[PDB]
């Protein structure tokens, strides 16, 4: 299952 | 042996051509198993490996909503980075991420990771401790501080040690017949003429799995890992791989060279001559 990325 | 769950994410801006292209490709070891591509009306997360049919409606729905949220995050990131770097609003730019985890034969975490890149150059990365970040330039440093204050590290490590590890084991379970198989290489050797009374001997290795393999040419026991040419191992379209390696030997001295193929599907290594 994929991760939910946080903004740069 | 050890296994890995990897996610390759790419977001490319295309000024004057609409919204940026967003793509997520999933891998369990060497075989692709999932993918999301923004270029398509009704873009959704789709299975890429047969065994993923064992998932169910819910799985696909959630991953899709998740992927669409990420798509918007990187859309914003591209604009943000134009600010960090002081760049034109009309040039094309790329952001990349490789996230994942590797477990031992027993299924326990060996390592987790996440590395970002902007325009083909390192940006920010999670250190092996899973607690800190290492920024490649002053732009990435702004991102590092934001993430430190927000506590992004704990959230990412919770995923790496938790979600990533548990789902990797599940995929391995459901796709055991394919992910845990061993396809032995089938070797061949070709010869091609050359100008100065020399010849090109090429050793082929076909239909293997997993990808890792070693090919070498020897001259009376000594490895010729120098004047030897080769290509990186390549996927062949059905879940297997191939590779070739060659040496340029003097005409009429061919029988003095041997190709050695080492692989998981080879109890004893293969030796070929022309």
């Amino acid at each position: 299952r994929g991760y939910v990325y946080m903004g740069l | 042996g050890p296994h890995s769950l990897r996610y390759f994410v790419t977001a490319v801006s295309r000024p004057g051509l609409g919204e940026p292209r967003y793509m997520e490709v999933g891998y369990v070891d060497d075989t692709e198993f999932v993918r999301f591509d923004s270029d398509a009306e009704n873009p959704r997360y789709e299975p890429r490996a047969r065994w993923m049919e064992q998932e169910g409606p819910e799985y696909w729905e959630r991953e899709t909503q998740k992927a669409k949220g990420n798509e918007q995050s990187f859309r914003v990131d591209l604009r943000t980075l134009l600010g960090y770097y002081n760049q034109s609003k009309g040039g094309s730019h790329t952001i990349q991420v490789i996230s994942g985890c590797e477990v031992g034969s027993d299924g326990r975490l060996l390592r987790g990771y996440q590395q970002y890149a902007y325009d083909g150059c390192d940006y920010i990365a999670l250190n092996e401790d899973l607690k800190t970040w290492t920024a490649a330039d002053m732009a990435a440093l702004i991102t590092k501080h934001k993430w430190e204050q927000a506590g992004e590290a704990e959230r990412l490590r919770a995923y790496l040690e938790g979600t990533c590890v548990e789902w990797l084991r599940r995929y391995l379970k459901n796709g055991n017949a394919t992910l845990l198989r061993t396809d032995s290489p089938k070797a061949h050797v070709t010869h091609h003429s050359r100008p100065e009374d020399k010849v090109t001997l090429r050793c082929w290795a076909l239909g293997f799995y997993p990808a890792d393999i070693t090919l070498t040419w020897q001259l009376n026991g000594e490895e010729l890992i120098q004047d030897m040419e080769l290509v990186e191992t390549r996927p062949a379209g059905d879940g297997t791989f191939q590779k070739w390696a060659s040496v340029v030997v003097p005409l009429g001295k061919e029988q003095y060279y041997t190709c050695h193929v080492y692989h998981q599907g080879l109890p004893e290594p293969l030796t070929l001559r022309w």
């Binding site: - | 692709e32 083909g120 379209g237 059905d238």
Partner: protein, 99 residues
């Protein structure tokens, strides 16, 4: 910066006129990601081309495979035409069945 793509065209099995096979076109080590890959049979674009195995190496260079099923014939010729920013002129690599 900018990296020119390495195009590689190969079959899954050793060719044998009449027996079904899979033709591949692996485009690698390129950057930026935008690229156009076309597989041709006797100079004509092949319809059912599948794009897969997209990935990038440690140096961030891109990799992607294009493949299709084909029943080889001694007459038919196949190639792969690629368009990338690193080249003003599109590059076509042919299928050398005797390589």
């Amino acid at each position: 910066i900018q990296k020119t793509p390495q195009i590689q065209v190969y079959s899954r099995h050793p060719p044998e006129n009449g027996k079904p096979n899979i033709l591949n076109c692996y485009v690698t080590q390129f950057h930026p990601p935008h690229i156009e890959i076309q597989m041709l049979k006797n100079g004509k674009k092949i319809p059912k081309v599948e794009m897969s195995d997209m990935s990038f190496s440690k140096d961030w260079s891109f990799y992607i495979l294009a493949h299709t099923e084909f029943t080889p014939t001694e007459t038919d010729t196949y190639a792969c035409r690629v368009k990338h920013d690193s080249m003003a002129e599109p590059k076509t690599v042919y299928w050398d069945r005797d390589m």
